[PDB]
Amino acid sequence: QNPMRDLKIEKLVLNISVGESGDRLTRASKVLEQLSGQTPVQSKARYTVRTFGIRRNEKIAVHVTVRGPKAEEILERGLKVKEYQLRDRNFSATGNFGFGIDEHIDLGIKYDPSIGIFGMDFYVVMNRPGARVTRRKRCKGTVGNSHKTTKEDTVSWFKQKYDADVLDK
């Protein structure tokens, strides 16, 4: 209908969350370093609950953000593991989606410290050209309703190339 009205993978955030901190976080950092190819960022604790074994500001998690082509190659690598099987859930009403995997270290061979299974949260953010108007410092504005990414638009975009299906089991 218009080339500027095309879905695109704006972002691919990649998250790991640990109940404690230490060498678990450090290896949670190398597993992100090897795949993304860039330094991951660790996260503080917003507040302490004394039931999940977490204290404020102790670096309990790690996550890294990837964009452009690399987000596509990583996404296909992670979706072949799921065999392109997602649900009716896992697609947010704002047009983003995501899933989770565990122990894909059998691909991307580093020295392979294969001592410890890591789960891994893929979340992907979809946008069309013009998302800059909501992020730029000057004259920041809000995307019009027609241009907004929705869950149906993301589902159709997925059911196209990436040749997948949803709501199944």
Contacting residues toward another protein, per CB under 8 A: 137-141
Residues numbered 122 to 161 that lie near RNA (CB under 7 A) are: 123, 125, 128-147
The answer to whether 11 contacts RNA (rule: CB under 7 A) is yes
Question: In terms of CB distance, is 61 or 155 closer to RNA?
Answer: 61
CA atoms of 48 and 40, how far apart (whole Å): 24
> Hey, CA dihedral for 84, 88, 89, 90, is it positive or negative?
positive
- Reduced to 3 states (helix: H, G, I; strand: E, B; else coil), residue 65 is strand
Site string for RNA, 97-126 (x = CB under 7 A): ------------------------x-x-x-
The reply on whether position 59 binds RNA by CB under 7 A is no
Q: What is the CA radius of gyration of the chain?
A: 18
CA distances from 110 to 70, 119, 142 (A): 18, 18, 44
Among 22, 44, 100, 110, binds RNA (CB under 7 A): 44
For another protein, the closer CB: 43 or 150:
150
* Residue 96 touches which of another protein, RNA, none (Cβ within 5-8 Å per kind): RNA
Rounded Cα distance between 32 and 52, Å, is 24
Strand partners, 42: 62
- Among 27, 92, 150, 166, which residue interacts with RNA (rule: CB under 7 A)? 92
Q: Is 19 among the residues that bind RNA (CB under 7 A)?
A: yes
- Can you tell me the distance from the alpha carbon of 115 to that of 70, in angstroms, rounded to the nearest whole number? 27
